[PDB]
Amino acid sequence: NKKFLPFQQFGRDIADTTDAVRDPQTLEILDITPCSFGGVSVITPGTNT
Amino acid sequence: SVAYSNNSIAIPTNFTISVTTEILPVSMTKTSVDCTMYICGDSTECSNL
Numbered sequence: 001n002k003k004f005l006p007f008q009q010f011g012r013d014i015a016d017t018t019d020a021v022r023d024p025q026t027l028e029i030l031d032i033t034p035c036s037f038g039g040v041s042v043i044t045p046g047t048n049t
Numbered sequence: 050s051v052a053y054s055n056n057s058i059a060i061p062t063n064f065t066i067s068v069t070t071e072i073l074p075v076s077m078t079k080t081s082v083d084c085t086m087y088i089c090g091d092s093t094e095c096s097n098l
């Protein structure tokens with residue numbers, strides 16, 4: 001929902017990476033949310049139980 | 050230069066109840082850091098190395 005000037009293409013975050021973009025073919029404001037959510041947690045009781 | 054005597058003394062006659070506030074840290078921010086998503090962002094040869 002930001003204010004992209006027509007030359008402004010790349011939104012940067014505080015972490016200085018790519019945040020918000022625009023298609024060079026069609027003028028449109030986009031937002032990016034990265035994939036690879038978290039890790040694997042395993043719950044188990046005692047094996048003898 | 051607080052005075053001092055041989056046969057005289059100073060005894061309090063009235064008091065004051067003061068509230069003192071201490072601040073102690075207890076919990077650091079718990080942090081889990083994955084290594085592969087940190088180092089090798091979307092790669093195979095990086096993980097093989």
Ligand SMILES: *[C@@H]1O[C@H](CO)[C@@H](O)[C@H](O)[C@H]1NC(C)=O
Binds near residue numbers: 055056
């Ligand atoms: C207590 O100390 C003072 C300090 O000079 C002295 O003059 C006095 O004689 C002392 N008291 C006694 C009982 O000696």
Ligand SMILES: *[C@@H]1O[C@H](CO)[C@@H](O)[C@H](O)[C@H]1NC(C)=O
Binds near residue numbers: 062063064065
């Ligand atoms: C003791 O001190 C308080 C303030 O510190 C005062 O308001 C009060 O009247 C005093 N009382 C006596 C008996 O000296």
